[PDB]
Design a protein around this ligand. Structure first.
Ligand SMILES: Nc1ncnc2c1ncn2[C@@H]1O[C@H](COP(=O)(O)OP(=O)(O)OP(=O)(O)O)[C@@H](O)[C@H]1O
Ligand SMILES: Nc1ncnc2c1ncn2[C@@H]1O[C@H](COP(=O)(O)OP(=O)(O)OP(=O)(O)O)[C@@H](O)[C@H]1O
Ligand SMILES: [Ca+2]
Ligand SMILES: [Ca+2]
Ligand SMILES: [Ca+2]
Ligand SMILES: [Ca+2]
Ligand SMILES: [Ca+2]
Ligand SMILES: [Mg+2]
Ligand SMILES: [Mg+2]
Ligand code: NA
Ligand code: NA
Ligand code: NA
Ligand code: NA
Lengths: 295, 295
């Protein structure tokens, strides 16, 4: 009756949105990282009554379907229509919504895996549906497929689970530092992203390396005009303590960086001494977890 | 400043819904008729102010965007975003909404043609956009493309304007009788329609004839389970006065029939003597009209 799923938070380094009217053919190209910190989804399922009820909650509080539309879209599709009883989905996030961590993808996939497990289905069907729910509601283009890949992911062929190709990079003794400030809140950037994004991808596929990705990221965040002065200034001070250059979480107001244990300390002293908020998450190398909640 | 467009009402004899996530590739197969009675759309456009305003009205009364979503979708896309002034769209219907006459397609296409004319564009782009607006809002699958064909239309290849193929049948001294009662209001019919619909199409393409279409229609409305007993009974009494068999407006509660002037009279005496409502519309053989409203 109690199923739990964990979906790591996903951060994008640089991207190229490939929009497509066909959900499965819709996606993006780019690179990103997955965190040991993310979303935990719990599916409580009780049979009974003369009715079919689906409730959703965000961090302990019930939410209207209107704020939960993506999760609901996923739930209505997986919970049988002849089914009688109560389905409850409790989601817990390690990050605020709208900060670029892909919580909505976490809720979509987490719900799809937990509910497919309880009512029947497969990994692929769950993933496609969560991808589909993301696309149809403008939730995200590569968080779901990115989360399914784990570790440091690279989307080389646009599309949803099943149709697109992602690759993974090897890395050593790396952790993820994040400075989440807030939500990000033209026609030239749509052009710039198209051109810089694809360029970054090509470069990364030339040199498959986490170090290179961060450099290619920083250049991307800057040559597109996406990087705000307020962040750029924080970056200039951050980069002075790290071997690898920090960069902008893609479509949030924050920065992230791949760091080593020792640097991390310095980065803390520095950041905290700037009244700036910071989190440290391990790179989640595994795949999304799903299973009967037994502890 | 005042542009008028006329889109004939469209009635479907039998169909096959071909759903597709790609608007343009979405459509249907089937046959239908266009009426001299339909929708008149008037686009009043005034430049000025420091703001962009779009208002819509149905039969003289202003309507919220929520009831006008399809027209609004079309209007927001055609009215420039840098545009300052007031755009007003007045739609007038010759039939009630939800009765199977395709008013929503009339509003979509009528608005798209009138606004493309005023702000720039082409017939095809207007048609595709109205088709797209219909599909995205579950407005209809073949009314727009059907209205663009005029007369007695046959959709042989599914799709939106541009991509799909429609054919037209020849006919002689035929008029259209309609008995609009109300709105129509499983999984077996989705199966039946798939199989009977395509069968009807194949048969019609064997014998391209309006007489044959009505017979193939009646058989379709019945072998699918779509035809309600209340209509079927009215049909049995109607068919006794007409040479050609009456049939169900597709997805409404009413019937229609191709009739000759003399029969029409009998059909009136009979119908009126049954407390039943009836309309007579000529088969609109032309194409949708658009142009500066000059009378
Ligand atoms: N676009 C910006 O992107 C952010 C919303 O996407 P975000 O990167 O924060 O992930 P999310 O909301 O947790 O999940 P999802 O990407 O699936 O919608 C907001 O700051 C918004 O202004
Ligand atoms: N489905 C049924 O179909 C009807 C709605 O489609 P209808 O054939 O009446 O055309 P419409 O509403 O005027 O325009 P559109 O088909 O573009 O939505 C309703 O009776 C509904 O119950
Ligand atoms: Ca947690
Ligand atoms: Ca460590
Ligand atoms: Ca679509
Ligand atoms: Ca009128
Ligand atoms: Ca006549
Ligand atoms: Mg979001
Ligand atoms: Mg309708
Ligand atoms: Na997340
Ligand atoms: Na990896
Ligand atoms: Na109409
Ligand atoms: Na014709």
């Amino acid at each position: 009756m109690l199923i739990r799923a964990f979906i790591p938070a996903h951060i994008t380094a640089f991207f190229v949105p490939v929009f497509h009217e066909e959900p499965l053919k819709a996606g993006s190209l780019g690179a990103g990282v997955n965190l040991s910190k993310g979303t935990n989804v719990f599916a409580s399922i009780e049979t009974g009554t003369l009715e079919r009820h689906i409730h959703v909650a965000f961090n302990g509080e019930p939410v209207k379907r209107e704020e939960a539309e993506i999760t609901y879209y996923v739930a209505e599709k997986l919970v049988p229509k002849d089914f009688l009883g109560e389905v409850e989905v409790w989601q817990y996030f390690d990050f605020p919504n709208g900060y670029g961590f892909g919580n909505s993808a976490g809720g979509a996939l987490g719900t799809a895996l937990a509910l497919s497990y309880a009512f029947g289905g497969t990994w692929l069907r769950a993933a496609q549906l969560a991808h589909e729910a993301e696309v149809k509601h403008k939730g995200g283009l590569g968080d779901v497929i990115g989360q399914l890949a784990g570790g440091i992911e690279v989307r080389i062929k646009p599309g949803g689970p099943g149709i697109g190709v992602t690759d993974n990079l090897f890395f050593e003794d790396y952790k993820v530092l994040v400075v989440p400030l807030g939500r990000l809140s033209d026609g030239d950037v749509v052009k710039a992203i198209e051109v810089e994004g694809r360029k970054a991808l090509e470069e990364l596929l030339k040199e498959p390396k986490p170090e290179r990705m961060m450099v290619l990221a920083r250049n991307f965040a800057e040559k597109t005009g996406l990087l705000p002065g307020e962040l750029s200034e924080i970056a200039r001070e951050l980069d002075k303590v790290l071997k690898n250059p920090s960069s902008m979480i893609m479509l949030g107001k924050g920065l992230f960086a791949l760091v080593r244990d020792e640097e991390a300390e310095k980065a803390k002293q520095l950041l905290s001494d700037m009244n700036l908020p910071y989190d440290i998450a391990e790179i989640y190398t595994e795949r999304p977890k799903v299973g009967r909640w037994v502890g």
